Amino acid sequence: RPDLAWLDEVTMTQLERNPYEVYERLRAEAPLAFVPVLGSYVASTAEVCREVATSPDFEAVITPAGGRTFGHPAIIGVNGDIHADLRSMVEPALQPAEVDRWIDDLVRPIARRYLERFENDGHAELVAQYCEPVSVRSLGDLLGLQEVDSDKLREWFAKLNRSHTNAAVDENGEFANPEGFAEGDQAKAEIRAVVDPLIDKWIEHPDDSAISHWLHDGMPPGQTRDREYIYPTIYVYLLGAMQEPGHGMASTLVGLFSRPEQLEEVVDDPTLIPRAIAEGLRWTSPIWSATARISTKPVTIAGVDLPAGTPVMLSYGSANHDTGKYEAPSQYDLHRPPLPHLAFGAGNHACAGIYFANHVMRIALEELFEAIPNLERDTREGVEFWGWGFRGPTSLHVTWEV
Ligand code: HEM
Ligand SMILES: COc1ccccc1O
């Protein structure tokens, strides 16, 4: 678009390091805009992202690098009867009444286990030592992957993250970095080696694991869903569902450390943890720009006439800094009004795991502050945030008096 000629000089590295400056310009100049290096239109404001995600004239589409990573039928990329079946498949263990029955007994012992490894050290790097392991161990146990170590689940989500977000396209519209998908293919090959024997077992001997229920629930007697039909949703889980509660926890902690008086309020009154996490997710949204919708008819949005069949990436992390909606959105503020945010998306493809994820993060933070109420951020170490499609802190060094 003519007035956006500067977008041709935006690089993938710039977006990964810090997308907020480019997107601040997009929100003012062009809430719906084609970004050449991403090969796609992007929605940057709250109004546009919410309209696209909820519109009857759009449906889900996987991003280009997302499709190369996950294939079909990834739950994020399908619609109609297949999407309705996949949602019916994943929803039982995520239903709020079901989560409330067992979430505490799942997450709290796991948080205690990881805490005991470091709570008397006086220093820790909380992303690797706590946030990521609690997130992956909780979900891994729910899924039936009790025997897959947390380091391995963390390695898989990192590789899948890099493949899914390997979005850069060249001057011809072709992927600029095709070898960046190789580590995704490698992760998937390893996942298959580990998970295929578990599926073999669950087909004949169902148990209470969620993946066993994905095979069996709603199927006629003696039948299971084909493994090829469920694997792309397994992969979707082994990326975002494993990665995001850890990132959300960690971003919430960074934000609280940036407002020391608010950190103190939350440590003294842990009933404020849920509000702290909601602000954390708005402040640095873990899924920042990983999903998309495609138009099914011509539409006009934010002045742009789009033809049918036009993908639009939903940059919810930008929408969550919309200054039309928020005052000083780049500042973390526990006491912001409880406005809707888009960190779980919207519409029929909104996050299916919200209630689970919010309890994972809550319980992990409750236990952290009970164990180390005098946590302080190691402030000469910097908190680097990284990522355009998924965003979170790369490390979180903390210190405390033992
Ligand atoms: C803080 C943690 C999490 C955040 C911020 C988050 C955010 C999101 C977002 C932004 C999307 C895309 C929504 C859209 O395109 O409108 C999504 C999709 C999804 N999430 Fe979550 N997620 C989190 C954790 C989880 C967990 C732990 C699970 C599973 C237990 C999960 C299951 C799903 C599923 C199944 C979808 C696909 C929904 C669909 O396409 O129908 N999420 N999530
Ligand atoms: C829940 O996991 C995901 C959500 C959106 C995009 C990729 C994912 O793996």
Author numbering: 6 to 407
From the paper:
The closest contact is with GcoA-F169, which forms a hydrophobic interaction with the C6 carbon on the aromatic ring of guaiacol. Each protein variant also crystallized successfully with guaiacol and the structures showed that the orientation of the bound ligand remained consistent with that of the WT enzyme. Furthermore, comparison of the surrounding active site architecture confirmed no significant deviation from the WT. Thus, the GcoA-F169A mutant, which showed enhanced turnover on guaiacol and syringol, is closer to the CYP255A consensus protein than the WT. It is interesting that although none of the GcoA homologs in our analyses exhibits a histidine at position 169, the GcoA-F169H mutant was stable and showed the highest specific activity on guaiacol.
